[PDB]
């Protein structure tokens, strides 16, 4: 293949580049020199490793297409990514829509996705809410009276006009669930690729601490992502999970020039079998790293292992094969 | 094959029908129209989809054998299932024995399976018990005095003669474990297929909530099944897990005309390495859905991926091949 | 092959012997008669089963090489293992270094591995510590004053000179993570094989118990190993995990005549992305049992399923092929 597949050396590059190799592409990783051995020795998936944050000129010379990882913007910055001259797999317009709280909320609302209700006025609280001062210092409130007592105790607020820099959301209790999707622009087909539960510290460690021991300390709960655990869902939940993905894609077609490639809806499942979404990640997510050898979902419909990384490379190949590569790049 | 494999469109139908396809059968899903796309588009495992709860006449015409899912009776009702004219993979007599609390207890006792002791009289409590008023309102009691104090506080009981509508069981603390078995009637051989931990809401979410935050609320703990997480057991535990399965099968041979096909013992492992069983599910369980591409157990003994769904289809094929199909159907 | 692969019938023998078979070796399990069916009927991976703790003469006659399981010394005792005449895969000198608290600490320090700080004097406590009286009776202390109050309340200590039989360690809160490594002496190459989270009772069950219910009882937290759950790590964490493994191997080359074959660093990941190690297991660990059909890591670099058991057999084969078997045996 003339086209080479390139990605930033973090997040999901091992999976992406292995998938590319499996589909007959030459591969490029670019990033920190510290991690070069990971991609060239321990897991030799990168044919070229460039020790630079964003080697635009070298990437153009190598006829690269960049597959954006789930931390691509974090490492490069939104402006650099939006203005990059190297072709980008996916729609670069999505980056603002997935990251700006207001745009994200608008997208999810248009897509008819269940999300926590936001309260602009504490005096409107009628069911338990989570209060987010600007995980740092998050607390629950039952009602307006409870809220104001806690605003005084935790935030020093003694007058209503003094309240500032807070978010108040409907509190939704459920188990974390992260469905991984792929929308093929070539085939105009949505797929469910896999599902995981993100493994987080210290939040996933506190359950091992008895209540008595916890209560002696002021707990500082954190949600740092450490890894991922494979799951499957109850089968009867799949249709609504898939329909949610379809609606997100459709809404993006209207709002931002489309959504294609991998994405994920991040949320929880309540005891009443409701999927409530906290965030959309409109790129490959780290949970897909479990499924290098396929998943319980891909093995229902393919005769070979298909990771999200491989699926991306399959899409790029099929685009080239059908003379429509420009359609999947921005 | 003349025989087609049919199942209700929920619970584990994707796995069942993929397994059937893998073994060279034509496949039928039947159920809600809402879920037709799941089985024909997103995961195209159903050659026929019938939009009816139980299309008996159409199934007979299609020469179907029905593989009962783990929620088959829930959707159809016990009477309809017991009287169905379409051949059923497994022993239909098992349905009452697995579902009636007294029959289930008798089965497990005959099979020498460790289960929580039941207390008929609260005044007999000598170790911690779980009290189940008729997960709704479950609480622990240490001894008779503690029980009666709590019966007054939680249930309004002020006289011993006024106590009604409760179950009292030995409280057994351990980690949830769900071994998945398959008994081949064709080969007269029990297999361990896989093992999972069922993922439940809100119970599996509360560990993420610090004790201090929990204590401000009356917790309403629920056990709604959301998904499944793959596990393996400590190897030295396998023999007793397998022996338990053998005993369950043997006991069924005496009591109810036999047990064959998939089943699962649902319970916990204590810190003293004891498997304590809460329930028997005498049909395919949703935890097997993880293992479409085989499991850490099947890959010890097969040269190809074998899910429980595939194993069912293998049994039906081998029955046909050996002119003994009638032996595995009721 | 003239050489046969033998292992004790527990811990990881199914995986080890399946891996051996996959690489063209004849296989031997030895151990308790009770478990013979596991290795010969339910999972037929053992060509020979010897119903003895350590059948030295029979093993020599069968030209066996013993692959030590992760519980080998537990069942046989250190002296028997150190003096065994049957060739042993790995370095027998490592057994003391991984098991003696002081030697283990020296090894990890030489290897520059982050470990909990040990306090010899309670009056030196300046950050939260875990106190380990000789999981039985473990508690946290904030500072010297808190420690002495608790030493009085829990341990009956009323004078400083009366304190004895305790360990005091820096308390490190993070999520359990168990990377599985393999060092090839034949290739002089370290590999990351897989990663798991060990499933433990009753510790992993207490998160399901609401704080209110816990507080009515004196909790007795236990860490009995029941099983294993597959995970992957955040990709950016891999380099430092791998570097830790390299340093452990290098340090062993100096201290104890080398480390080769499988091993595992057991620890936690903090919210600041720090891997803190509690223990080294310098042999195959049970978490590798999940990966009979390979792992998310091995499928990045092999075209076939490679468990740690298979990798061991691959090493023995390659040693034989290159006339250097003596180099990997002690
Ligand atoms: N622009 C940046 N500058 C410095 N560090 C970063 C940047 N973006 C992400 N990181 C850090 O890089 C580490 C690995 O990132 P990730 O690719 O998300 O696993 C994390 O500790 C991040 O906080
Ligand atoms: N509305 C909500 N209800 C319940 N839990 C939440 C809510 N919002 C956030 N969380 C939890 O708090 C964590 C951090 O929230 P955030 O800082 O908003 O990403 C999330 O990953 C969730 O686990
Ligand atoms: N006979 C029935 N009538 C109506 N709903 C049902 C019936 N049986 C099960 N359900 C519901 O169908 C949903 C999916 O069931 P399952 O097949 O168990 O995943 C659950 O919300 C059940 O409560
Ligand atoms: N005897 C028992 N000891 C400990 N936990 C139990 C016991 N019985 C039930 N449970 C827990 O409570 C949940 C709901 O119980 P049930 O409503 O009886 O199915 C179960 O799934 C278990 O997790
Ligand atoms: N030397 C020994 N004598 C008796 N029992 C043992 C010995 N070593 C281990 N065990 C027990 O054997 C069981 C299984 O061990 P494992 O191989 O670690 O799964 C555990 O209950 C151990 O406590
Ligand atoms: N320094 C420490 N900080 C936090 N947790 C620990 C520490 N040491 C031990 N633990 C926990 O307590 C369990 C039993 O400890 P041990 O008896 O030292 O193996 C370990 O498996 C850890 O989960
Ligand atoms: Cl991610
Ligand atoms: Cl089930
Ligand atoms: Cl182990
Ligand atoms: Na987002
Ligand atoms: Na049952
Ligand atoms: Na050790």
Among C192, C208, C273, select the one facing A42 at the smallest CB separation.
C192
Ligand whose nearest atom lies closest to the CA of A270: 2
Beta-carbon contacts of C18 under 8 Å, excluding residues fewer than 6 positions away, are: B299, B300, C43, C45, C292, C307, C309, C310
Q: Please choose, from the candidates A22, A1, A21, A4, the residue with its C-alpha nearest in 3D space to the C-alpha of residue A67.
A: A4
Q: Which two tokens stand for residue A182?
A: 């792929």
Q: Is the CB of B74 under 6 A from ligand 3?
A: yes
Long-range contact list for C96-99, CB < 8 A, 24+ apart?
A: C97/C252, C97/C255, C97/C256, C97/C282, C98/C280, C98/C281, C98/C282, C98/C283, C99/C73
Indicate whether C44 and C143 sit together in one domain: no
Beta-carbon contacts of B12 under 8 Å, excluding residues fewer than 6 positions away, are: A235, B69, B70, B284, B285, B286, B288, B289, B308, B309
Task: Report the number of distinct structural domains present in chain A.
Answer: 3
Q: How far is C195 from chain B (nearest CA, A)?
A: 13
In the Cβ-directed half-sphere of A39, how many Cα atoms lie within 13 Å?
Answer: 32
Residue C309 and residue C17 in contact, taking contact as beta carbons nearer than 8 Å: yes
User: Burial of A282 by CB count in 10 Å (0-12 exposed, 13-18 middle, 19+ buried)?
Assistant: buried
Ligand whose nearest atom lies closest to the CA of C170: 6
Indicate whether C149 and C229 sit together in one domain: no
Indicate whether B196 and B328 sit together in one domain: yes
Q: How was this structure determined?
A: X-ray
Instruction: Report CA Rg, chain B.
Output: 22
Neighbours of C104 (CB within 10 A): 18
- For chain B, say whether A125 makes contact (Cβ under 8 Å): no
Residue B261 and residue B283 in contact, taking contact as beta carbons nearer than 8 Å: yes
Indicate whether A228 and A242 sit together in one domain: yes
CATH number at residue C305: 3.30.470.20
Q: How far apart are CA C174 and CA C270, in angstroms?
A: 4
Residue C281 and residue C70 in contact, taking contact as beta carbons nearer than 8 Å: yes
Residues with CB under 6 A from ligand 5: B 234, 236, 273; C 10-11, 71, 74-75
Indicate whether A180 and A319 sit together in one domain: yes
Indicate whether B40 and B144 sit together in one domain: no
Indicate whether C44 and C79 sit together in one domain: yes
- For chain A, say whether B218 makes contact (Cβ under 8 Å): no
CATH number at residue C150: 3.30.1490.20
Indicate whether C168 and C183 sit together in one domain: no
Q: Is the CB of C169 under 6 A from ligand 6?
A: yes
Packing angle, helices A308-321 and A13-22, rounded to 10: 40
CATH number at residue A5: 3.40.50.20
Cβ distance B228 to A232 less than 8 Å, yes or no, reads yes
Residue A299 and residue B295 in contact, taking contact as beta carbons nearer than 8 Å: no
Cβ distance A239 to B38 less than 8 Å, yes or no, reads yes
Tokens 């980008």 belong to: A88
For residue A287, the chain C residue with the least C-alpha distance is C232
Q: Is the CB of A75 under 6 A from ligand 1?
A: yes
For atom 2 of ligand 6, the residue with the nearest CA is C171
Q: How far is CA C242 from CA B224, C275, C310, in A?
A: 40, 11, 20
Out of B42, B71, B87, a domain closes at B87
SS3 A149: helix
Q: How far apart are CA B61 and CA B124, in angstroms?
A: 58
Q: Is the CB of C116 under 6 A from ligand 6?
A: yes
DSSP state of C236: G
> Please, what's the b/e burial string for C163-184 (b: 16 or more CB within 10 A of its CB; e: otherwise)?
eeebbbbbbbbbbbbbbbbbbb
Q: Is the CB of A53 under 6 A from ligand 1?
A: no
Q: How far apart are CA A38 and CA A44, in angstroms?
A: 7
Out of B173, B189, B217, a domain closes at B173
Tokens 């020599």 belong to: C60
Q: How far apart are CA A288 and CA B191, in angstroms?
A: 31
Neighbours of A33 (CB within 10 A): 11
Among A14, A210, A222, select the one facing C271 at the smallest CB separation.
A222
Residue numbers of the domain that contains B127 = 116-173
HEC secondary structure over C274-324: CEEEEEEECCCCHHHHHHCCCCCCHHHCCCCCCCHHHHHHHHHHHHHHCCC
Q: Which two tokens stand for residue B150?
A: 């709590």
DSSP state of A218: -
For residue B217, the chain C residue with the least C-alpha distance is C212
For residue C208, the chain B residue with the least C-alpha distance is B203
Peptide bond into C202 cis (omega under 30): yes
Q: Please choose, from the candidates C32, C39, C50, C41, the residue with its C-alpha nearest in 3D space to the C-alpha of residue C15.
A: C39
SS3 content of chain A, % helix, strand, coil (to 5): 40, 25, 35
Tokens 């670019």 belong to: A30
Q: How far is CA C201 from CA A71, B179, B318, C73, C222, in A?
A: 36, 17, 41, 23, 6
Indicate whether A12 and A97 sit together in one domain: no
How many residues are recorded in chain B? 330
- For chain C, say whether A213 makes contact (Cβ under 8 Å): yes
The answer to whether the annotation marks A167 as part of a ligand binding site is no
B-chain residues near A176 (CB < 8 A): 205
Residue A116 and residue A170 in contact, taking contact as beta carbons nearer than 8 Å: yes
Indicate whether B258 and B137 sit together in one domain: no
Strand order in the sheet with B64-66: B48-50, B27-30, B4-8, B64-66
Ligand whose nearest atom lies closest to the CA of A107: 10
Cβ distance C305 to B299 less than 8 Å, yes or no, reads yes
Residue C179 and residue C245 in contact, taking contact as beta carbons nearer than 8 Å: yes
Paired residues of A261 in beta bridges: A183
Residue C298 and residue C306 in contact, taking contact as beta carbons nearer than 8 Å: yes
User: Burial of C130 by CB count in 10 Å (0-12 exposed, 13-18 middle, 19+ buried)?
Assistant: middle
Q: How far apart are CA B263 and CA B280, in angstroms?
A: 8
Indicate whether C271 and C306 sit together in one domain: yes
Q: How far apart are CA A178 and CA A290, in angstroms?
A: 13
Antiparallel, parallel or unpaired: β A175-184 and A261-269 = antiparallel
Mutate to test the pocket of ligand 1, among C232, C236, C237, C270 (most ligand atoms within 8 A of CB): C236
Tokens 């008669």 belong to: C33
Cβ distance A214 to B212 less than 8 Å, yes or no, reads yes
Out of C173, C204, C219, a domain closes at C173
Indicate whether C228 and C247 sit together in one domain: yes
């Amino acid at each position: 293949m003339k086209v080479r597949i390139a990605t930033y050396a973090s997040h999901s590059a091992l999976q992406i580049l292995k998938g590319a190799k499996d589909e007959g592409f030459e591969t490029i990783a670019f990033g920190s020199s510290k991690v070069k051995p990971l991609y060239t020795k321990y897991f030799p998936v990168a044919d070229y490793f460039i020790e630079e944050k964003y080697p635009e000129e070298e990437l153009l010379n190598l006829n690269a297409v960049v597959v954006p990882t789930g931390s691509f913007v974090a490492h490069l910055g939104i402006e650099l990514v939006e203005n990059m001259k190297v072709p980008y797999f996916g729609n670069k317009r999505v980056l603002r829509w997935e990251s700006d709280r207001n745009l994200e909320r608008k997208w999810l609302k248009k897509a008819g996705i269940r999300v926590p209700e936001v309260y602009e006025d504490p005096d409107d609280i009628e069911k338990p809410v989570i209060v987010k001062p600007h995980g740092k210092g998050y607390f629950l409130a039952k009602d307006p009276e409870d809220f104001w007592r806690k605003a005084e105790k935790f935030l020093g607020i003694k007058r209503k006009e003094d309240l500032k820099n807070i978010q108040i959301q409907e509190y939704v209790l459920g188990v974390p669930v992260y469905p991984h999707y792929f929308y093929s622009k070539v085939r105009e087909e949505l797929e469910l690729m896999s599902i995981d539960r993100r493994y987080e510290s210290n939040v996933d460690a506190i359950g091992r601490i008895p209540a008595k021991d916890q209560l002696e300390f002021d707990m500082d709960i954190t949600y740092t992502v450490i890894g991922n655990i494979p799951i499957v869902l109850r089968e009867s939940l799949l249709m609504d999970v898939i329909e949610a993905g379809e609606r997100v894609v459709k809404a993006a077609e209207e709002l931002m020039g489309g959504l294609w490639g991998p994405f994920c809806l991040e949320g929880v499942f309540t005891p009443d079998l409701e999927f409530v979404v906290f965030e959309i990640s409109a790129r490959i997510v780290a949970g897909t790293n479990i499924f290098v050898n396929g998943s319980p979902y891909t093995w229902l419909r393919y005769d070979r292992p298909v990771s999200t990384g491989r699926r991306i490379a399959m899409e790029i190949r099929e685009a080239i094969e059908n003379d429509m590569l420009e359609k999947v790049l921005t």
